[PDB]
C-alpha cells in the first residue's frame, strides 16, 4: 500500500509497502530508491519518532499518510 | 568533434584553447546536451578544457566563461538527464568560481533571480551556485557600488521577488550556507514566514528545519513569534470552525518534535524561547501563550536541564 | 554548563584508566556523546578523544576493534568536510588518537593517518597550522616509542628545508615594487651560505607562510626528541637574513597607503613571530656566541615592533588579525616559552650612564 515521505529538501517521495511490514524495511527502501542508508535516517509521523522493530499497524499509519525524514548525521 | 579539445587542454594553456573559442564561434549548446546523450563521461571531461583555457585575466575568456555558465544553468534546469552527471557538473561549476572579477557574477545572479520569478526550477540543484558566488562577491571589495551593496540588492530582489510555492524550501536552504548579517537573515525569515499562510500544510516542518538551523546564527525570537502567531491563530480558526484536524495536529506534533531536537543542539534557543513566553508581568500571559505553545513547552520538558524552569513557568 | 562537563570528563578518564573492562560494556553510551559535539569547547574535545582513544587502544580490547574502525571512520568523515570546525575537530581528534596509539603496522597506520590528515588539511592555511601546533603540543607534553618520530622527522625536515629555505642568492624571484635584499643577517657568519629564506616572493605569490613559525616549532621539538637536544643540523639557521623589502622607512612612503601597507605590516608581523619562535628555540643553548646572536635578534625585535607600531599609528586600520597594541601583545603574537627567561642570568648594560634595557622591558 502507498504512503508518502517528505524530507529536508522537500522531495515528496511515494513508498509502496504493506502495513504489516516493519520500519527498517522502509529504511531499506530509502537506501534503494533514494540512496540514503538506514543509520542516518530519522523517521517521524505526527510528532512520534518511529523505531525499527514496529510496523505501520502499530502506529495506526494508513494510506497516503505523510511521514517526515531527517538526516541524523552523527558527526556532520 | 570532442577529441580536438583534449588535444588542447593537455599540452599548453591560452596558446591553443583561447584560439578554439574565437575560431569555432558556431554555438555552445548543441555540442554539450547531445554529447551527454551518447556518453555522459566525455561531457564532464569537456568542461575541464574550457575553464582551464578561459581564465578571467582577459575579457574574451571571461565572456566565453559567462556564456558557458548561462548555458549550463539552462541544461541542468532543462534536461531529464542521469543524476550522477548532474551531481558531477554542479560539483565542477562549484569548484570554479574563485578568481572571477566583480561585475560578471551580477548577470548569473540576476539570471537565477529571473529563474525564481518565472524559471522551471524542477531542480534546486541549479541554486547550489548562488551560495558561493555571493561570498566571492563580498570578498571583492572594489567598485563593481561595492560587493556588499550588490549582495544586499540581490537579497532584496530574492525576497521581494515572488516565490514558486513548490520549491521555496530549497531557496530557503540556499541562505543557510552564506554568512549574513542579522538584517538579511531577518528579511528572509520575515518574508519566508509570511509565505506560510499561502501553502499546503505538510511541507512546513522541513522548511522549519532549514529556518531553524539558519536561525541558529541570526534572529530566532522573530521566527518563534511568527510560528506561535501562525499556529495560535489557526488553532482559534479551528476552535471557531468547531463551535481539518487529523493532519493539522499531526503536523503540529512533528513541528514541535523538530524544534525540540534542534534545541537539543543549541540551548541559547531554549533561553530565547522561554524569555518570549516568560509571563514576567501577568498581561504578557494574556498575549504570550496558546494551547500550541503550551504543548511545545511540555514537550520541551523532557530535556533534564529544562524540567525546572518550564515547569516553574507553567505552574506560576 | 562547562565546569560540570570538565568534571564529568575528569571522572570518566579516572574510571576508564582504573576500571576499563566495566566501561567497555557501556562503550555505546560513550559513543552516544557523538551528536552534540558542536555544543562543546575544543579543550573538552581533546579530553573527549583522549578518553575514547585510551578506551579503544588498550592491548586487552583488540577483541572489540569495531569501535576502533568506527572512530577511525568518523574522523575520516569529519576531516572529509570543507568546514573550518569539522576539519579542525577531526584534526584535533586525529592528532590525540594518533598520539595515544603511538605509546609495526600501527606505525604504518598512524603514518597513513598523518599523511592523509595533511593531504586533507594541505589546502586550508589555519587548519594546516593547527595540525602543526597540536602535533607540536603532543610531542612536547608526551614521550613515546621513537620509531614513528624518526620516521616522520625525516619527512618534516626535508619538507621545511625545501619549502622556504633557498640559496643566499642576492637575486630572488618575483617582480615587486620594492628593493628586495637579504636583511637582518647577524654578519659574524659566512655571507656565501646556501641557507636563506624566500619569504617575500612566497607572500606576493600568496597574493604556507602563516604556518612557518609553528612548522619550525614542530621541527625543533622533533629534532630534540631524535638527537636528545642537539640542533647542530639547524644551529646555522639563525645565520639567515631574509629576502625582503627595504622595511626600515615607514615615513618616506607615507600618503601612498594601499594594500602595499597591509603587505608591509603583516610581513613585519610574520617576521616578528619567526624571530619569536627562534628565541624560544636557541634559549637553552649554553654557547655564549649563540646567546649574543639571540640578543642581536632581540634588538632586531624591539626596533621591528617599533617600526610596525609606527606604521599602524600613521596608517590606522590596515589591521592584520591572524589568530590595538594591547590586543597585538598577547594573542596575535607567539606565546614565548618559560626557559627563554634564562636570558635574565645576564647583567644589564645601560646606554647613557655606562643587554639593552628595552628588550628587558619586553621580557
Coordinates of C-alpha atoms in Angstrom, one line a residue, chain C residues 22-311:
Chain C
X22 CA 33.4 -2.2 33.1
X23 CA 33.3 0.8 30.8
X24 CA 33.7 -1.4 27.7
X25 CA 30.1 -2.8 28.1
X26 CA 28.9 0.9 28.2
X27 CA 31.0 1.8 25.0
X28 CA 27.8 2.6 23.1
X29 CA 26.7 5.1 25.8
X30 CA 30.2 6.8 25.5
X31 CA 29.6 6.9 21.7
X32 CA 26.1 8.4 22.5
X33 CA 28.1 11.8 23.2
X34 CA 28.9 12.0 19.4
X35 CA 25.8 14.1 18.3
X36 CA 26.3 17.3 20.4
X37 CA 30.0 17.9 19.5
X38 CA 29.2 21.4 18.0
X39 CA 27.9 22.3 21.6
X40 CA 31.3 21.7 23.3
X41 CA 34.6 23.7 23.7
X42 CA 37.7 22.4 21.9
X43 CA 39.8 21.6 25.1
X44 CA 36.9 19.3 26.2
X45 CA 37.1 17.8 22.7
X46 CA 40.8 17.0 23.3
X47 CA 39.9 15.3 26.6
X48 CA 36.9 13.5 25.0
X49 CA 39.1 12.0 22.2
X50 CA 41.7 11.1 24.8
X51 CA 39.1 9.0 26.8
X52 CA 37.6 7.3 23.7
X53 CA 41.0 6.5 22.3
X54 CA 42.6 5.1 25.5
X55 CA 39.4 3.1 25.9
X56 CA 39.9 1.8 22.2
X57 CA 43.7 1.4 22.2
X58 CA 44.2 -1.0 25.1
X59 CA 46.0 -4.2 24.3
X60 CA 43.2 -6.3 26.0
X61 CA 40.4 -4.6 23.9
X62 CA 41.7 -5.6 20.5
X63 CA 38.8 -8.2 20.7
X64 CA 36.2 -5.3 20.3
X65 CA 38.0 -3.4 17.5
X66 CA 34.6 -2.4 16.0
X67 CA 34.6 0.9 18.0
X68 CA 38.2 1.2 16.6
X69 CA 37.2 1.2 12.9
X70 CA 34.1 3.3 13.9
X71 CA 36.2 6.1 15.4
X72 CA 38.8 5.9 12.5
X73 CA 35.7 6.2 10.2
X74 CA 34.0 9.2 11.9
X75 CA 37.4 11.0 11.9
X76 CA 37.9 10.3 8.2
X77 CA 34.3 11.7 7.7
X78 CA 34.9 14.8 9.9
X79 CA 38.1 15.6 8.0
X80 CA 36.3 15.0 4.6
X81 CA 34.1 18.1 5.3
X82 CA 35.1 21.5 3.9
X83 CA 34.0 23.4 7.1
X84 CA 36.6 25.1 9.4
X85 CA 35.2 23.4 12.6
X86 CA 34.5 19.9 11.3
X87 CA 38.0 19.7 9.6
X88 CA 39.5 21.3 12.8
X89 CA 37.5 18.9 15.2
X90 CA 38.7 15.9 13.2
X91 CA 42.3 17.3 13.2
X92 CA 42.2 17.5 17.0
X93 CA 40.6 14.1 17.5
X94 CA 43.0 12.6 14.9
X95 CA 46.1 14.1 16.5
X96 CA 45.1 12.9 20.0
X97 CA 44.2 9.4 18.6
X98 CA 47.4 9.1 16.7
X99 CA 49.5 10.2 19.8
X100 CA 47.9 7.7 22.2
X101 CA 48.1 4.8 19.8
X102 CA 51.8 5.9 19.4
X103 CA 52.5 4.7 23.1
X104 CA 54.9 -2.1 13.2
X105 CA 51.6 -2.0 11.2
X106 CA 50.5 0.5 13.9
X107 CA 53.4 2.8 12.6
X108 CA 52.2 2.4 9.0
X109 CA 48.6 3.2 10.1
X110 CA 49.4 6.4 12.1
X111 CA 51.7 7.3 9.2
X112 CA 48.9 7.0 6.6
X113 CA 46.6 8.9 9.1
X114 CA 49.0 11.9 9.4
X115 CA 49.8 11.8 5.6
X116 CA 46.0 11.9 4.8
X117 CA 45.0 14.5 7.5
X118 CA 47.8 16.6 6.0
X119 CA 46.5 15.9 2.4
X120 CA 43.0 16.9 3.6
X121 CA 44.4 19.9 5.7
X122 CA 47.1 20.7 3.0
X123 CA 44.8 23.4 1.4
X124 CA 43.4 25.5 4.3
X125 CA 46.2 27.5 6.0
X126 CA 44.8 27.8 9.6
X127 CA 43.8 24.2 9.6
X128 CA 47.3 23.0 8.4
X129 CA 48.7 25.5 11.1
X130 CA 46.5 23.9 13.9
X131 CA 47.7 20.4 12.8
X132 CA 51.3 21.6 13.2
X133 CA 50.5 23.2 16.6
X134 CA 48.6 20.3 18.0
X135 CA 51.2 17.8 16.7
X136 CA 53.8 20.1 18.4
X137 CA 51.9 20.2 21.8
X138 CA 51.6 16.4 21.6
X139 CA 55.3 15.8 21.1
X140 CA 56.1 18.5 23.8
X141 CA 54.0 17.1 26.7
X142 CA 54.3 13.4 25.8
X143 CA 57.1 10.9 25.1
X144 CA 56.8 7.7 23.1
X145 CA 58.5 5.0 21.0
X146 CA 60.9 7.0 18.8
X147 CA 60.3 4.8 15.7
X148 CA 57.3 6.9 14.4
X149 CA 59.3 10.1 15.4
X150 CA 62.5 9.2 13.4
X151 CA 60.1 8.2 10.6
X152 CA 58.1 11.5 10.4
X153 CA 61.0 13.9 11.2
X154 CA 62.9 12.6 8.0
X155 CA 59.8 13.9 6.1
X156 CA 59.3 17.2 8.1
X157 CA 63.0 18.4 8.0
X158 CA 63.1 17.7 4.2
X159 CA 59.7 19.5 3.6
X160 CA 60.8 22.6 5.5
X161 CA 64.4 22.8 4.2
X162 CA 63.0 22.6 0.6
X163 CA 59.8 24.8 1.1
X164 CA 61.0 28.2 2.4
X165 CA 64.9 27.6 2.6
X166 CA 66.8 28.8 -0.6
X167 CA 70.4 29.9 -1.5
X168 CA 71.7 33.3 -0.2
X169 CA 71.2 34.5 -3.9
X170 CA 71.0 38.3 -4.0
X171 CA 68.5 38.0 -6.9
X172 CA 65.2 36.3 -5.8
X173 CA 62.2 35.5 -8.0
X174 CA 59.1 37.9 -8.1
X175 CA 58.9 41.4 -9.6
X176 CA 57.9 43.5 -6.5
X177 CA 57.6 47.4 -6.3
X178 CA 60.3 47.0 -3.6
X179 CA 64.1 46.8 -3.3
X180 CA 64.5 43.1 -2.2
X181 CA 67.6 42.4 -0.1
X182 CA 68.9 39.9 2.4
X183 CA 68.0 41.8 5.7
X184 CA 68.8 41.0 9.4
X185 CA 71.8 38.8 9.0
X186 CA 74.0 38.5 12.1
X187 CA 77.1 39.3 9.7
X188 CA 79.6 37.4 12.1
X189 CA 78.6 34.3 9.9
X190 CA 79.9 33.4 6.4
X191 CA 77.9 35.6 3.8
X192 CA 78.1 32.9 1.0
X193 CA 75.7 30.4 2.7
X194 CA 73.2 28.1 0.9
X195 CA 70.7 29.0 3.8
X196 CA 68.4 32.0 3.4
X197 CA 64.5 32.4 3.4
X198 CA 62.4 33.1 0.2
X199 CA 59.8 35.0 2.3
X200 CA 58.5 38.0 0.3
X201 CA 58.1 36.0 -3.0
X202 CA 56.1 33.4 -1.1
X203 CA 54.0 36.3 0.2
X204 CA 53.5 38.0 -3.3
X205 CA 52.7 34.6 -4.8
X206 CA 50.2 34.1 -1.8
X207 CA 48.7 37.4 -3.0
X208 CA 52.0 28.3 3.5
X209 CA 53.8 31.4 5.0
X210 CA 51.4 31.7 8.0
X211 CA 52.3 28.0 9.1
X212 CA 56.1 28.9 9.0
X213 CA 56.7 29.6 12.7
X214 CA 54.7 26.7 14.0
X215 CA 56.3 24.3 11.5
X216 CA 59.7 25.4 12.9
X217 CA 58.4 24.8 16.4
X218 CA 57.3 21.2 15.4
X219 CA 60.6 20.7 13.5
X220 CA 62.7 21.8 16.6
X221 CA 60.8 19.6 19.1
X222 CA 61.1 16.6 16.6
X223 CA 64.9 17.2 16.2
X224 CA 65.3 17.5 20.1
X225 CA 63.4 14.2 20.6
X226 CA 65.5 12.4 17.9
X227 CA 69.1 13.6 18.9
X228 CA 68.1 14.4 22.6
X229 CA 68.5 18.3 22.4
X230 CA 71.1 18.5 19.6
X231 CA 70.2 21.2 16.9
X232 CA 73.6 21.0 15.2
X233 CA 71.6 20.4 11.9
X234 CA 69.9 23.8 12.5
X235 CA 72.5 25.8 14.6
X236 CA 73.4 27.6 11.2
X237 CA 69.7 28.7 10.6
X238 CA 69.7 31.9 12.7
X239 CA 72.6 32.9 10.4
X240 CA 69.8 33.6 7.8
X241 CA 68.9 37.0 6.5
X242 CA 65.5 37.2 4.7
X243 CA 64.8 38.4 1.1
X244 CA 62.5 41.4 1.9
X245 CA 61.6 45.0 1.0
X246 CA 63.6 47.9 2.5
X247 CA 61.3 47.5 5.6
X248 CA 63.0 50.3 7.7
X249 CA 61.3 53.6 6.5
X250 CA 57.6 54.0 7.5
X251 CA 57.5 57.8 6.9
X252 CA 59.0 58.5 3.4
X253 CA 56.4 56.2 1.8
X254 CA 53.6 58.0 3.8
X255 CA 50.3 59.0 2.0
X256 CA 50.5 56.3 -0.8
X257 CA 48.5 54.0 1.5
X258 CA 47.2 50.9 -0.4
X259 CA 47.3 47.1 0.0
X260 CA 51.2 47.7 -0.1
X261 CA 50.8 49.0 3.6
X262 CA 48.9 45.7 4.5
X263 CA 51.7 43.7 2.8
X264 CA 54.4 45.6 4.7
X265 CA 52.6 45.5 8.1
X266 CA 51.6 41.7 8.1
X267 CA 55.1 41.0 6.6
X268 CA 56.8 42.6 9.6
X269 CA 54.2 40.8 11.8
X270 CA 55.3 37.4 10.4
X271 CA 58.9 38.4 10.7
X272 CA 58.4 39.1 14.4
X273 CA 56.6 35.8 15.0
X274 CA 59.5 34.0 13.2
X275 CA 62.1 35.6 15.4
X276 CA 59.9 34.9 18.5
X277 CA 59.9 31.1 17.8
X278 CA 63.7 31.4 17.1
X279 CA 64.4 32.8 20.5
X280 CA 62.1 30.2 22.1
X281 CA 64.4 27.7 20.3
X282 CA 68.0 28.8 20.9
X283 CA 67.5 30.0 24.6
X284 CA 68.6 26.6 26.2
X285 CA 71.9 26.6 24.2
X286 CA 74.8 27.4 26.7
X287 CA 77.1 28.7 23.8
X288 CA 77.8 32.4 24.6
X289 CA 78.1 33.5 20.9
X290 CA 74.7 31.8 20.3
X291 CA 73.2 33.9 23.2
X292 CA 74.9 37.1 21.8
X293 CA 73.2 36.3 18.5
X294 CA 69.8 35.8 20.4
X295 CA 70.2 39.2 21.9
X296 CA 71.1 40.6 18.4
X297 CA 67.7 39.1 17.4
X298 CA 66.0 40.8 20.4
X299 CA 67.5 44.2 19.3
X300 CA 66.0 43.4 15.8
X301 CA 62.7 42.5 17.5
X302 CA 62.3 45.7 19.5
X303 CA 63.3 48.0 16.5
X304 CA 60.9 46.0 14.3
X305 CA 57.9 46.2 16.7
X306 CA 58.7 50.0 17.0
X307 CA 58.7 50.3 13.1
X308 CA 55.3 48.4 13.0
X309 CA 53.5 50.3 15.7
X310 CA 54.7 53.5 13.8
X311 CA 53.3 52.0 10.6

